[PDB]
Design a protein around this nucleic acid. Structure first.
Ligand SMILES: C#C[C@]1(COP(=O)(O)OP(=O)(O)OP(=O)(O)O)O[C@@H](n2cnc3c(N)nc(F)nc32)C[C@@H]1O
Ligand SMILES: [Mg+2]
Ligand SMILES: [Mg+2]
Ligand SMILES: [Mg+2]
Lengths: 558, 398
DNA sequence: TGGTCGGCGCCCGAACAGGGACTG
DNA sequence: GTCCCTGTTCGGGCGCCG
C-alpha cells in the first residue's frame, strides 16, 4: 500500500524548471520488466498516467537486485537533482556490529518496495515525468508521473529516512527496551525477551509498520542465525564480515587499484595488519581510471602479505558496557599504524588502521597522537565513550615530547606495551650551548630572478666554506647551509642561523619528511651526540652572522 | 500572545549549514531528555530534511549538580544575523539567565535558521532535527530582543542599589559590587529572588598584566647576549624606545657561544634603560569596536600560559599569563580550554566582546576534547596556528 | 554492456588562506 | 607588492550499505 504519512514539501531552486530529457533506447528484456512493474504500480496509485499537459521527461532504466531475480526501476534524475532544493541529510553515519550489545533474541527484516510506499509531494509530482516504450506501432509508449518516492532523486534518501523515523517513533516510545537499528528500510530488532514473547513483539512491529503502509514480506524476514545484516553475518555471540574477494589480475589499472584498496580498507575493520601505503602511492599523478600501472617491489610485497592475512579466519564480538574499552596500537613503517579495539584479551570488537600523512615534516610521536585522536572520535561514534589505550611508547618518551613541544598535545588514559617497533624520539636538541663544540654561523641566500643561490658557514675556529646552488629558493638555501654545517662538524656542534623557517622545522624533531634535503639533515642529526641550534635576527650586524651573510650574498644579491 | 519582531540575515548571506560532531552517550541522553521537555513546553518543534540549515549542539554538566546545560553553537548564525566600572569591582558574579529567553516567541520566518540535529549512538537512528519557536539561548538576537524586558525587571533592583553594576552579555548577567564577601553573596541571592518574581565568582581588581622582562645575570656569554639582542629587536616593534646598539657591538667577530663577554659601561646602562622602557605603557593603542579582538596564546611549559589581546599588530590592549598545576597529570587541552574561557571572560568584562583566538594546537586535537572541559554559555571564534618558537621565547619568564 | 540517489570510509590533487623573506 | 612554503577544504574516483 501507500503510507498515510504526510508528504514533505519540496520546491525547485529559484528560476528553475523541470527536466526535459528524452528516453534513451532500452533492451527488450528491460522494457518487459519496466512495463510489468509500472502496470502494477499504476493499479496501486503509486504512479499516474499523464497527458500532453506535462511537458517534462527523464530517462529511466533498470538493473538487477541483490536477489538477482527481480528488477529495480531507476531514474536518471541528474538534471532534476541539479534544479531541486537543498536538503539536510539526516543519515550521520553507518552502524557497526561492534557497537551492538548482546541481546537474547534478534530479528532482521526488510520493507518491500520501501520507496514506493512513501508518498511524494503533490506539487512536485509533475517533475518526475517519464516515458516507457513498448512494441512499436502496436501500442505506443506510456507516460507516467510518480506519486511516491523515486529511486534516483536527490531528496528520496533523506525523505525516506526521516519518514521512517516518524513511523517508528510511536513503537519506540511504547517499547523503549527493544532496540531497532534503522538503516534505510533495513531493520535489526533485538530484545531481552524469550524467543516466544520476542516473536509476538515482532508481529506487533510488523502490524505497526503495516498500519503505516510498510509491508514486511516473509521472504526478507530472517528468524535464525547467522543473520545477514549490513554486509556482515551476525551470530549469537560473534560477528564476521561477508567474504571479501580481492581481484587477481596480472596487469593492474588505476580502477583496479581503486577497487583493491577499497576492499582492503573495508577488510581492515576486522582484519588486523592491513597496509595500503605502497598501493595508494601508485595512484599519484595518474589521470584516468584505464591507466595500466606497473607494481613496484614494495607494492607487490605489500599486496602479498595482505593476501596472507585475509586467508586466516577472523571474527568480532559484541559490546558489553559493563567492561572497559581498550585500544592497542601497533606501528608499521612508512607512517602506517594498525589498532585493535577489545574488552577482553584476544577478543577484538573491531580493528582498523591509520596511515594519513599530515604535514610535510613529522615524527612517529605526532602520528601516534593523531592515530589516538582518530580512534577516540571513532570510539565515541560507535560506543559513545573514549577507550583506554595501550601504546608502544615509553612514559618517559612522552614526558619529554609534550614538555618541550610548543603546541598543546594530550593523550587520554594509557599504559605502555612492549610490542616493537617502539615509538621514540631519534634525537634531542640541546637547551644550552655546548662547551667545547665548534660554533657554526650558517646562512643561505638566493636570487629570485636567476634562481641561483649560495649556502655556507663561518666558524669561531676560522673555518669557512660556500656551496653554490642552482634552481633553488631562499628557504632551500637556509636548509642547505644547516646541512653543510652538520656534514663538516664533529659529533658536537653549535649552529647559529637567522632562518626561523629552518629553525621551526628542526625544533619539531622530525624523523620523516617529503623533502629529501630535510631527510638528509635528519640522518645527520641522528648521528650527532649533541646539537645546539640558536637563532639571531638577520641583517643586524651580529657576528659572525654578518660574516657568513656577506659570504653567501656576494654574486647573487646587491 | 506576545508580538514577534521580524529578524533577517545580512544581505547576501544564507543560513548556517554546519554538520553535527560526534557526541558521547551521556551528552546524547541529556540532550534527548532536555529536548523532550522543551518540545512538551512548545519551545522547539520537530522538522524534516527539507530545511537545509543546521547548527551543532552539545551539552555541558557543571561540576556539582546532576543538571545538564544544552549548548547550541550559534556563532555561525550570529555572524550571519559598555560599563567601564564593571572591571573595577571587588567581586563580580556571573548569573545564567538563559531560561528567561524562552518566554518570548521567535519570528516565524527566522525559525528555520535555528535548526539543529540530535545524533544517535552507533547510528542506530538517523539524526532527529528540531528548530526553535522562542528566543534561543546563545543567539545574538536573543539579548537584543529581550533588552526592553530585561530593563523592566532590573529597574527596581538597580534603583535600590546604585553602586552595583549589572551588565548583560549573551545568556549571562554580570553583577559587580564593592561589598564585602558575604554581603555580596547575600545581595546576589536577592537578585535571584528578584528574577524569580517574573520567571521562569570573579575579582577584576586582582587582574594584572604581565610585562616583558629581561634577564638579570652576573656573567653573560655570547649566547646570552645573542638571545637578549634578538628579544630586544623584536620588542622594539612594540616599544620604539628600545635600543640595541651597544649590546650588538659586543658581538663583533666570530665568537664561540660559551665565551664569557664582560658588559661595558654603555652596554650595562643600555640594558638598564631598556628595562625601564618595558615598564612604560604601550603608546597609541585605542580600542576599535568595529574591529575584532585577537587573542594569541603561547604554551610556555610547566603549566604556564601567556596571552596577548590586540586588534592591530604590536598594538597590545592587554598582556597576561595563566598558571595552573605543575604536576605530572597535566592535561594541556584542558588547561588551554580553561585559559580561553578566562581570557574571553576578561574580554567581556573589559570591552563587552568576545575575542578571536589563535590556538596553538592541532585542529583535530582541539575539536576532540574541548567540549569536555567547557563551562561557559558562549563560544568564541578561534583558528589554529603553527606558532613559531620565537614569540614563545619573547613572553617567557625566569 | 552501461547509465540513478544518499550516507560513511579511503587517498589523491586543485584551489584556496596565512606568514616569512625579499628589492631598491 | 611577489615568491615560497605550509596548512585546510572541497570534489573526484573507488570501496561498503540500502
Ligand atoms: C528505502 C529504501 C531502499 C531499500 O532497498 P531494497 O533493496 O530493499 O529495495 P526495495 O525498494 O525495498 O524493494 P524490495 O526488494 O525490498 O521488495 O534503498 C534504496 N535503494 C536501494 N538500492 C538503491 C539503489 N541501487 N539506488 C537507489 F537510488 N536507491 C536504492 C531504495 C530502496 O527503496
Ligand atoms: Mg526493501
Ligand atoms: Mg534494505
Ligand atoms: Mg639568512
Amino acid at each position: 500500500p501507500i503510507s498515510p504519512i504526510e508528504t514533505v514539501p519540496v520546491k525547485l531552486k529559484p528560476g528553475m524548471d523541470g527536466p526535459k530529457v528524452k528516453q534513451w533506447p532500452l533492451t527488450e528484456e528491460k522494457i518487459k520488466a519496466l512495463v510489468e512493474i509500472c502496470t502494477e504500480m499504476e493499479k496501486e496509485g503509486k504512479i499516474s498516467k499523464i497527458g500532453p499537459e506535462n511537458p517534462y521527461n527523464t530517462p529511466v532504466f533498470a538493473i538487477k537486485k541483490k536477489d538477482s531475480t527481480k528488477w529495480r526501476k531507476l531514474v536518471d534524475f541528474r538534471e532534476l537533482n541539479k534544479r531541486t532544493q537543498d536538503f539536510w541529510e539526516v543519515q550521520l553515519g553507518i552502524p557497526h556490529p561492534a557497537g551492538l550489545k548482546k541481546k537474547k533474541s534478534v530479528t532482521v527484516l526488510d520493507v518491500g518496495d520501501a520507496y514506493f510506499s512513501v508518498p511524494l509531494d503533490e506539487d512536485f509530482r509533475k517533475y518526475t515525468a517519464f516515458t516507457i516504450p513498448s512494441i512499436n506501432n502496436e501500442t505506443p509508449g506510456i507516460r507516467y508521473q510518480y506519486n511516491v518516492l523515486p529511486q534516483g532523486w536527490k531528496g528520496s534518501p533523506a525523505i525516506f529516512q526521516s519518514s521512517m523515523t516518524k513511523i517508528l517513533e510511536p513503537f519506540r516510545k511504547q517499547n523503549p527496551d527493544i532496540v531497532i537499528y534503522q538503516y534505510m528500510d533495513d531493520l535489526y530488532v533485538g530484545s531481552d525477551l524469550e524467543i516466544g514473547q520476542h516473536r509476538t513483539k515482532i508481529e506487533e512491529l510488523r502490524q505497526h509498520l503495516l498500519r503505516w503502509g510498510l509491508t514486511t514480506p516473509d521472504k526478507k524476514h530472517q528468524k535464525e542465525p547467522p543473520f545477514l545484516w549490513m554486509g556482515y553475518e551476525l551470530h549469537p555471540d560473534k560477528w564476521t564480515v561477508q567474504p571479501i574477494v580481492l581481484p587477481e589480475k596480472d596487469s593492474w589499472t588505476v580502477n583496479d587499484i581503486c577497487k583493491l584498496v577499497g576492499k582492503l580498507n573495508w577488510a581492515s575493520q576486522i582484519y588486523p595488519g592491513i597496509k595500503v601505503r605502497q598501493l595508494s602511492k601508485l595512484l599519484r599523478g595518474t589521470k584516468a581510471l584505464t591507466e595500466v600501472i606497473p607494481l613496484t617491489e614494495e607494492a607487490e610485497l605489500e599486496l602479498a602479505e595482505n593476501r596472507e592475512i585475509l586467508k586466516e579466519p577472523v571474527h568480532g564480538v559484541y559490546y558489553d558496557p559493563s567492561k572497559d574499552l581498550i585500544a592497542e596500537i601497533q606501528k608499521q613503517g612508512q607512517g602506517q599504524w594498525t589498532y585493535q579495539i577489545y574488552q577482553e584479551p584476544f577478543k577484538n570488537l573491531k580493528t582498523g588502521k591509520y596511515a594519513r600523512m599530515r604535514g610535510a615534516h613529522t615524527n612517529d610521536v605526532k602520528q601516534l597522537t593523531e592515530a589516538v585522536q582518530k580512534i577516540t572520535t571513532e570510539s565515541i561514534v560507535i560506543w559513545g565513550k573514549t577507550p583506554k589505550f595501550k601504546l608502544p611508547i615509553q612514559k618517559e618518551t612522552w614526558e619529554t615530547w609534550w614538555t618541550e613541544y610548543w603546541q598543546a598535545t594530550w593523550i587520554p588514559e594509557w599504559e605502555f606495551v612492549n610490542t616493537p617497533p617502539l615509538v621514540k624520539l631519534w634525537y634531542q636538541l640541546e637547551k644550552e650551548p655546548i662547551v667545547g663544540a665548534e660554533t657554526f654561523y650558517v646562512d643561505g641566500a638566493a636570487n629570485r630572478e636567476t634562481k641561483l643561490g649560495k649556502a655556507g658557514y663561518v666558524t669561531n675556529r676560522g673555518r669557512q666554506k660556500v656551496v653554490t646552488l642552482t634552481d633553488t629558493t631562499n628557504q632551500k638555501t637556509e636548509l642547505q647551509a644547516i646541512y653543510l654545517a652538520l656534514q663538516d662538524s664533529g659529533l658536537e656542534v653549535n649552529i647559529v642561523t637567522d632562518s626561523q623557517y629552518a629553525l621551526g622545522i628542526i625544533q619539531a624533531q622530525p624523523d620523516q619528511s617529503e623533502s629529501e634535503l630535510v631527510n638528509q639533515i635528519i640522518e645527520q642529526l641522528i648521528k650527532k651526540e649533541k646539537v645546539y641550534l640558536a637563532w639571531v635576527p638577520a641583517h643586524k650586524g651580529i657576528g659572525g652572522n654578518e660574516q657568513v651573510d656577506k659570504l653567501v650574498s656576494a654574486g647573487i644579491r646587491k | 500572545p506576545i508580538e514577534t519582531v521580524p529578524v533577517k540575515l545580512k544581505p547576501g548571506m544564507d543560513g548556517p549549514k554546519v554538520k553535527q560532531w560526534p557526541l558521547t552517550e551521556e551528552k546524547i541522553k541529556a540532550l534527548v531528555e532536555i529536548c523532550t521537555e522543551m518540545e512538551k513546553e512548545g519551545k522547539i518543534s520537530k522538522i524534516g530534511p527539507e530545511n537545509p540549515y543546521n547548527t551543532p549542539v552539545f551539552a555541558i554538566k557543571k561540576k556539582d549538580s546532576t543538571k545538564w546545560r544544552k549548548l547550541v553553537d550559534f556563532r555561525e548564525l550570529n555572524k550571519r544575523t559598555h560599563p567601564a566600572g564593571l572591571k573595577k569591582k571587588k567581586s563580580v558574579t556571573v548569573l545564567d539567565v538563559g531560561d528567561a529567553y524562552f518566554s518570548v516567541p521567535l519570528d516565524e520566518d527566522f525559525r528555520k535558521y535555528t535548526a539543529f540535529t540530535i545524533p544517535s549512538i552507533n547510528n542506530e537512528t538517523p539524526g532527529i532535527r528540531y528548530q526553535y519557536n522562542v528566543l534561543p539561548q546563545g543567539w545574538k538576537g536573543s539579548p537584543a530582543i529581550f533588552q526592553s524586558s530585561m530593563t523592566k525587571i532590573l529597574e527596581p533592583f538597580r534603583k535600590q542599589n546604585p553602586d552595583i553594576v549589572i551588565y548583560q552579555y549573551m545568556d549571562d548577567l554580570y553583577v559587580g559590587s564593592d561589598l564585602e564577601i558575604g554581603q555580596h553573596r547575600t545581595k546576589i541571592e536577592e537578585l535571584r529572588q528578584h528574577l524569580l518574581r517574573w520567571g521562569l565568582e570573579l575579582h577584576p581588581d586582582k587582574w594584572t598584566v604581565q610585562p616583558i622582562v629581561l634577564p638579570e645575570k652576573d656573567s653573560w656569554t655570547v649566547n646570552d647576549i645573542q638571545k637578549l639582542v634578538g628579544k630586544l629587536n623584536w620588542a622594539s616593534q612594540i616599544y620604539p624606545g628600545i635600543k640595541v646598539r651597544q649590546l650588538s657591538k659586543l658581538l663583533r667577530g666570530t665568537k664561540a657561544l660559551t665565551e664569557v663577554i664582560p658588559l661595558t659601561e654603555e652596554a650595562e646602562l643600555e640594558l638598564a634603560e631598556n628595562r625601564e622602557i618595558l615598564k612604560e605603557p604601550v603608546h597609541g593603542v585605542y580600542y576599535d569596536p568595529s574591529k575584532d579582538l585577537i587573542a594569541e596564546i603561547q604554551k610556555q611549559g610547566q603549566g604556564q600560559w601567556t596571552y596577548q589581546i590586540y586588534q592591530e599588530p604590536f598594538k597590545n590592549l592587554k598582556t597576561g599569563k595563566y598558571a595552573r598545576m605543575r604536576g605530572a597529570h597535566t592535561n594541556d587541552v584542558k588547561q588551554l580550554t580553561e585559559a580561553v574561557q578566562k581570557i574571553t571572560t576578561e574580554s567581556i568584562v573589559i570591552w563587552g566582546k568576545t575575542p578571536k583566538f589563535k590556538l596553538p594546537i592541532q585542529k583535530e586535537t582541539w575539536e576532540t576534547w574541548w567540549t569536555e572541559y567547557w563551562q561557559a554559555t558562549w563560544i568564541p571564534e578561534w583558528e589554529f596556528v603553527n606558532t613559531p618558537p620565537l614569540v614563545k621565547l619573547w613572553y617567557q619568564l625566569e
